[PDB]
Amino acid sequence: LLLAALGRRELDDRDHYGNKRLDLAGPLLAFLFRGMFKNLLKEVRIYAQKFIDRGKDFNLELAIKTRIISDGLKYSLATGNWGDARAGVSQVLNRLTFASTLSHLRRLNSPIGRDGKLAKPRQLHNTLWGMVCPAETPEGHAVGLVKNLALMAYISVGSQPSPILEFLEEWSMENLEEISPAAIADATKIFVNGCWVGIHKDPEQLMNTLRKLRRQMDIIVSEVSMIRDIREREIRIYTDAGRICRPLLIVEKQKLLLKKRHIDQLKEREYNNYSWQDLVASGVVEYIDTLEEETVMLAMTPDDLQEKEVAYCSTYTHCEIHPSMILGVCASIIPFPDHNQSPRNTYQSAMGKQAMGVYITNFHV
């Protein structure tokens, strides 16, 4: 707060998508099951308070009533009134087109309510690049609030931070309960899932080590993200469940690591059993989330951006796989969508969900 009152650090944006999480079915059903399991415990306590004061022993199969844990899930999924709070969480699946079915399963809802005269929760922020489609949005009174996920974007399902904390204590990281407060400002503050776990003195060769473990999947899962803030001495590792990442290629010095032998082993699938996950394991692609996109130098295409010219930067770290993967599922069926105007792309993204067609193969059943 003092750095913000000085301006030595800029203020924070509410719409930067490094500042947001996506509650999927996992966290949503977990948030529902917390309350409903707690209510089942409360009803078991009420039953036991009734049947100890008669001096008798309770009957435990009558203690646990099953409707409070099943009818509640059935109500919150059948109605969408997410509680006994907000609404519209579970929508009925749209089965007019297979494109509409796919686009309804890849839809994000901003929790900001409707009919607001402001524009900043609705606009196409810069950090929607590659994670969420720029064109597809409902053009009614929910422009920008309801969005559709991009193609290769993937929401990190999250893992436990404890192997990362064991790895940091393995190396020369100094915990907060064992430091002097004099050597803090000449070293980098290191965070895990937000909580500040200690200090480290040498931030380079720590970030190189953490990345070297993620390009091998030794300890750290591929979804977990390291971010070295370089201007202000911080290094933060997120292992949350809900962050939104997308795979990018990896560029050593000025060369892709996607060599010809990977394409040779990758053309011959169902034979070599060489999958995508073998290529993530090979240290060639990796998932970059939105915080880490603020600290990455991203080549658009390799045929332009690793060849020597009047050089732009020559310090690329990642390369985009293909730019057409910034688009959603409904904006992917548009031929030449860069030649159109962008409201026309949005309107087609609306109409492509409404086209008649063979919506499913078992439609006769």
Binding site: E10, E204, T295, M297, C313
Partner: protein, 117 residues
């Protein structure tokens, strides 16, 4: 002139406060928890730079040379080590970013020199 720092007690380690000597006409720092006194160093007990002429090179750190997303030059050598390559960037700060001043940081290892062009 210069900035004024917070003085500290020696016994209870709280903040010392300015007061006057009615006898010797000198300023004395005095705590409010305990009863400890110190002789002042300067007459300047408060200061307020309002025009905000700050030395931006102090806020620059040397480690920002390791950033890949900063642009490099071989057009400006470092004055100390003579290394030809250096990154360059804006002020990155509020109470600033009205002028577009470049600050250069030499990217050579174990020099870390920064300067203003």
């Amino acid at each position: 002139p210069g900035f004024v720092g917070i003085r500290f007690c020696q016994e209870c380690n709280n903040m010392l406060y300015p007061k006057e000597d009615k006898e010797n006409r000198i300023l004395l720092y005095a705590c409010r928890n305990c009863d400890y006194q110190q002789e002042a160093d300067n007459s300047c007990i408060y200061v307020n730079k309002i025009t905000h002429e700050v030395d931006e090179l102090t806020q620059i750190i040397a480690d920002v040379s390791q950033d890949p997303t900063l642009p490099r030059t071989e057009d400006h050598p470092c004055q100390k080590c003579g290394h030809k390559e250096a990154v360059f960037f804006q002020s990155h700060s509020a109470r600033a970013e009205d002028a577009m001043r470049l600050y250069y940081v030499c990217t050579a290892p174990h020099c870390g020199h920064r300067w203003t062009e």
